[PDB]
Amino acid sequence: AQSVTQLGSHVSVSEGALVLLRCNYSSSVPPYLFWYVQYPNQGLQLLLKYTSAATLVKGINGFEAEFKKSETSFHLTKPSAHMSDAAEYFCAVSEQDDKIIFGKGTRLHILPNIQNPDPAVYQLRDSKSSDKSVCLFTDFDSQTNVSQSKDSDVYITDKCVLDMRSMDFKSNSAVAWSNKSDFACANAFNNSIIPEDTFFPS
């Protein structure tokens, strides 16, 4: 009879904005409630828990959650979204006096604040001998998304954000490649809506 519900498998937040991850439970009697984080590649870490006691609970790094019986809620918040907050988050509940049951998880995607975008498609060459190449779509802001290719011999990856700590510099990129003789980087992203000012060098 008891369960826990997280809303949205994947959610976005702007870099710097309030973080809000929602959890609701279905137990008649208030349960104990838990929020775990799983940073990429790693196991589960407890952030905070409601174990009757205080209604407003505090975790590391600004995380908090308020138990609200009247709306059967235990939403996780943090005041400001940082790129390091990218992870999967799991709400969990006590059940049958003998276990913890886990929600399905929500992955938090943080959209970097790119104030000076410089969208571009570049061609890169194999370091070992090669008429072998890939195309790199890079430096676009977070209004651009990348579409899967229309052609079964062209491969296109999801966008990914890197953070060059050396220069305090973040950027988006997606990669495209093909074995085809007629594959040109000018055409690699034709199935995506790209910025009108994308740079296409010679």
Binding site: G105, L136, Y155, C160, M167, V175
Partner: protein
């Protein structure tokens, strides 16, 4: 509660009995086996409050367990099938919901070991046009033609692992999406300053750890036996 699990990574053929073992030092009464799958969270398989006390969780079908000792809780796949591919976590609890998780077992079940294949890995050097336009330089690593999807990719600069300036795709893509046993590919980017790329003394290596066959596995093909191994590709900096 040093909670430990064995094995850490395993590939198995379908139709085999496979055992995962959980051990603890704190001797808590309560022990649990969960599986994690994308979009489903952690689902309970079985749990135990003492030796010879066993309770089904939500997904107990296809598994059995034994609580051989206060310190040990074993999970078996009775006859492995592909949808038992998952990350498996054991846990202990105190009597106040204080959970301790093991660090996980990544298990992949394949129908046919003949299809196992290590990746081919290549590094693609930065565009001149990027360097001129941005004064930054992005290297791309591509790992292709691997099966199953059971790899770890890392970058190494002058022999030291680097995390800054890196982004690796969160999941590999299927080379042939219509096939149940398609091979996979994966990309990663490493971005550095143009100055750093232009130093011919700097060495850049993409490393892919592949998990495959063990020494114990039969291999009947002429091609290389696809054992667990590292495959790398490299580039040096280029003044021109």
């Amino acid at each position: 509660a040093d909670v430990t699990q064995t094995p850490r990574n395993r590939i198995t053929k379908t139709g085999k009995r496979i055992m995962l073992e959980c051990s603890q030092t704190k001797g808590h009464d309560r022990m649990y086996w969960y599986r994690q799958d994308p979009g489903l969270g952690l689902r309970l398989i079985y749990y135990s409050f003492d030796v010879k006390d066993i309770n089904k969780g939500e997904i107990s079908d296809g598994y059995s367990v034994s609580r051989q000792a206060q310190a040990k809780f074993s999970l078996s796949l009775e006859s492995a099938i592909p949808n038992q591919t998952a990350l498996y976590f054991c846990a202990t609890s105190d009597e106040s919901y204080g959970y301790t998780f093991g660090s996980g077992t990544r298990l992949t079940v394949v129908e046919d070991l003949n299809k196992v294949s290590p990746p081919e890995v290549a590094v693609f050097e930065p565009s001149e046009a990027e360097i001129s336009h941005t004064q930054k330089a992005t290297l791309v690593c591509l790992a292709t033609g691997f099966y199953p999807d059971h790899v770890e990719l890392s970058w190494w600069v002058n022999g030291k692992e680097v995390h800054s300036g890196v982004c690796t795709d969160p999941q590999p893509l299927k080379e042939q999406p219509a096939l149940n046993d398609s091979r996979y590919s994966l990309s990663s980017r490493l971005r550095v300053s143009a100055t750093f790329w232009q130093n011919p003394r700097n060495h850049f290596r993409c490393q892919v750890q592949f998990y495959g066959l063990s020494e114990n596995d039969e291999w009947t093909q002429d091609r290389a036996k696809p054992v667990t191994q590292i495959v790398s590709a490299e580039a040096w900096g280029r003044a021109d």
